[PDB]
């Protein structure tokens with residue numbers, strides 16, 4: 061609910077399924093602490109990463125494992141991953157959708173931020 | 177259901193609401209016949225354009241009225257519209273999502289095609 | 293060179309070479325009249341489409357033949373073409389670059405308008 | 408010029424000027440070591456980051472300071488930065504252009520790798 065990730069494949073015209081996603085949160089000492097992880101579903105979506113209680117203010121990194129996705133499909137892509145880094149919840153709780161559209165040598169990403 | 181259009185705003189980080197969309201289908205005489213139209217909802221989505229019976233094989237044009245969207249928000253954009261032209265249903269019925277991500281001087285578009 | 297077109301390939305990480313591009317100007321009767329055309333170069337670019345004298349204010353359409361490009365690479369694409377339709381306005385910078393980044397089921401386009 | 412970075416602005420239709428870019432190379436201990444940096448030019452480009460001799464195979468990260476760019480324009484952005492992380496491979500073409508197209512809540516990036 062408060063953080064969702066959607067991944068699409070621009071080659072196939074389909075959801076990007078079984079894409080690994082790791083989320084980190086910047087700690088007080090400036091290191092990236094593991095926060096949540098999961099894999100996209102057959103709809104290219106990953107829900108259930110966190111709760112509104114746990115998803116406090118901070119700087120978050122959403123790392124989408126695009127290389128493995130191309131690798132597990134047998135293809136050699138350019139990027140290691142796609143990383144999305146942003147401050148969240150700093151004016152109170154919001155809901156965030158992080159969307160990515162993937163090609164072997166390119167990607168686009170956007171955020172949809174809503175106030176419930 | 178068989179044709180859906182989703183429009184996002186890359187400036188606001190939000191759905192693009194109240195965006196006019198016109199769909200045309202190429203006729204036998206090579207003119208563009210009006211096929212369906214509507215406006216995106218508060219979720220940036222437009223459903224209910226057509227039915228699987230009416231959505232036959234053909235070449236379709238999805239014209240997204242991006243200029244008015246920037247104009248109705250009081251902004252002067254580059255493009256007149258974003259047009260998406262594609263052959264549909266030529267190997268049998270499919271479901272099509274046409275997605276667009278808008279900026280004042282740029283847009284991206286993708287398709288998600290699924291076989292029910 | 294008031295109008296340039298740049299086409300890139302997101303699958304191969306390269307310029308999109310030998311892509312047909314047609315430019316049209318909207319006529320008084322609302323039909324699209326051919327204006328200029330060419331094929332992208334080895335660097336994915338098409339220069340020399342028009343001159344300052346001919347490129348007056350108006351609505352233009354740049355049609356990029358993406359379907360033929362993908363088919364020549366043996367890849368099944370979604371779109372018939374990519375269309376970029378815009379107004380040229382003299383109350384803006386003078387040089388327009390229309391850039392497109394192509395994938396089989398997606399494209400991105402931007403304008404770089406400079407003085 | 409084996410590595411070039413190009414940054415474009417999707418709101419204004421222009422090069423993204425005076426954007427800070429930092430390049431890092433992944434070290435043996437898995438930390439990111441500074442490699443090269445600069446600010447984009449009036450044409451949105453940053454050349455002269457490295458030489459052929461120094462740009463060996465490896466994993467590189469190009470960090471584009473998008474947040475400062477938007478803030479200088481008085482626009483509230485979403486991302487802290489844009490990150491492009493990739494492997495340089497000698498069994499590929501020799502010149503890498505990393506391009507980024509920026510909006511306040513979105514960015515696109517591509518690689519153009521040529522000989």
Ligand SMILES: *CCC(=O)Nc1ccc(/C=C/c2cc(C)c(O)c(C)c2)cc1
Nearest residue numbers: 066159161168169170275277284285286
């Ligand atoms: C409305 C559908 C939904 O519930 N969630 C959802 C739909 C679509 C997206 C993102 C689509 C998209 C399209 C394009 C062209 C680009 O470039 C990007 C990055 C994302 C997200 C969420």
Ligand SMILES: *CCC(=O)Nc1ccc(/C=C/c2cc(C)c(O)c(C)c2)cc1
Nearest residue numbers: 391393400401402506507508515516517
């Ligand atoms: C032709 C020499 C050169 O490298 N010039 C150059 C022009 C443009 C780019 C990238 C453009 C671009 C366009 C779009 C629509 C997207 O999404 C991206 C990421 C980049 C590179 C180089």
